[PDB]
């Protein structure tokens with residue numbers, strides 16, 4: 001078992017070399033996992049112990065391809081460095097192997113391409129297009145413009161991106177051609193790993209983007225008390241007091257929406273504190289996608 005380890009030791013040395021250079025290379029593409037994976041019990045791994053494990057719904061940045069079974073990349077989490085990631089074919093084969101084993105007792109798809117930076121989307125306090133909500137979101141946008149100036153892009157999205165259901169695109173106001181055009185734009189904005197914030201007028205609920213391929217960071221601008229909301233709108237004149245109704249319910253709908261559908265929830269009494277809470281979240285997200293050795 002001496003001459004055998006000869007070839008293996010070298011391949012492992014080469015694999016390591018490629019893994020190292022990849023640390024600074026850019027992100028070819030990002031994926032959201034639909035299944036979990038553990039390298040805990042396997043061989044066939046280029047550099048023993050360098051395979052990355054993940055749970056379903058995790059985000060991965062794929063930098064380059066090693067071979068038909070492994071890609072090189074990292075998990076998007078602070079401190080996580082480059083590592084080997086199983087390829088789609090590899091995961092599918094593992095699915096087959098496990099099924100065979102299951103039958104021997106005689107008792108889809110794993111990755112979704114996603115933008116390299118999760119686009120930030122704001123919903124709440126109520127309906128967009130009006131004022132209470134528009135002004136409060138407009139505030140957060142200006143804050144983010146400065147807090148992350150030089151590393152962020154805030155772009156308006158008129159096209160109804162809520163029509164961008166994976167299945168639909170894989171096959172109404174805006175047209176699919178226009179939507180697809182915007183998704184591409186979103187994807188291309190996050191390419192260089194800069195922070196991407198969207199001002200999507202058609203999105204008031206997280207469910208409108210659940211089936212899409214944007215995997216956004218849904219930010220819930222929540223005003224805890226309904227009374228606070230009511231008063232707030234009233235102080236906008238009859239040009240808003242009339243449209244009052246369509247604002248309380250919309251707000252109440254978000255209020256009943258399960259927190260899981262939200263990534264961040266801004267329910268601070270002071271607007272200055274909402275900003276800082278978001279900045280902190282984005283600052284950590286920024287670190288999860290950037291940091292040391294790149």
Ligand SMILES: [Hg+2]
Pocket residue numbers: 052074075080081082083
């Ligand atoms: Hg890792």
